Amino acid sequence: LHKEPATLIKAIDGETVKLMYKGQPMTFRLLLVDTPETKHPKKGVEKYGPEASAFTKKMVENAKKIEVEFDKGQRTDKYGRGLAYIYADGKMVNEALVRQGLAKVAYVYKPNNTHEQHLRKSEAQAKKEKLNIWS
Numbered sequence: 229l230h231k232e233p234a235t236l237i238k239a240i241d242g243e244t245v246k247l248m249y250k251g252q253p254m255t256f257r258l259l260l261v262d263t264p265e266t267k268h269p270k271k272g273v274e275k276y277g278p279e280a281s282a283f284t285k286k287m288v289e290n291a292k293k294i295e296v297e298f299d300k301g302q303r304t305d306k307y308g309r310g311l312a313y314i315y316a317d318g319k320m321v322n323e324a325l326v327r328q329g330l331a332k333v334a335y336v337y338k339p340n341n342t343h344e345q346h347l348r349k350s351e352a353q354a355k356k357e358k359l360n361i362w363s
């Protein structure tokens with residue numbers, strides 16, 4: 229796997245950010261994570277939804293360097309969103325959320341699962357600390 233620069237355009241929610249990637253604006257969906265939703269008629273605004281969104285927002289907007297890291301499989305989902313691990317100043321946003329109890333490790337579709345163990349570890353830790361979603 230290898231990281232590549234990208235430039236923030238706009239944070240959308242806990243698990244979705246719009247980035248300028250190789251001169252093209254594109255929506256990125258964070259691999260292996262599921263944050264409570266904010267925007268949707270179906271299951272409305274879930275608890276921690278606002279919290280997950282603010283955390284991703286703050287994390288990426290405060291970064292001086294954003295990097296994108298694709299996995300080994302498909303790089304886009306059916307909605308045309310890039311599927312990646314996003315790094316803000318070297319910190320993986322996907323793991324940060326999980327670690328904080330603001331996302332569940334989800335949507336594990338092989339072979340796009342290189343960091344699954346890593347994330348599972350952090351999830352178990354947030355669970356053990358009864359953080360947010362796990363409180």
Ligand SMILES: Cc1cn([C@H]2C[C@H](OP(=O)(O)O)[C@@H](COP(=O)(O)O)O2)c(=O)[nH]c1=O
Nearest residue numbers: 243244257258259260261305306311335337
């Ligand atoms: C994270 C991720 C989501 N998706 C799909 C599964 C879901 O499809 P459906 O829309 O059929 O439920 C949707 C969830 O996106 P969000 O959680 O952003 O809503 O995106 C993938 O296809 N691959 C992925 O790796």
Ligand SMILES: [Ca+2]
Nearest residue numbers: 262263264265
């Ligand atoms: Ca979601």
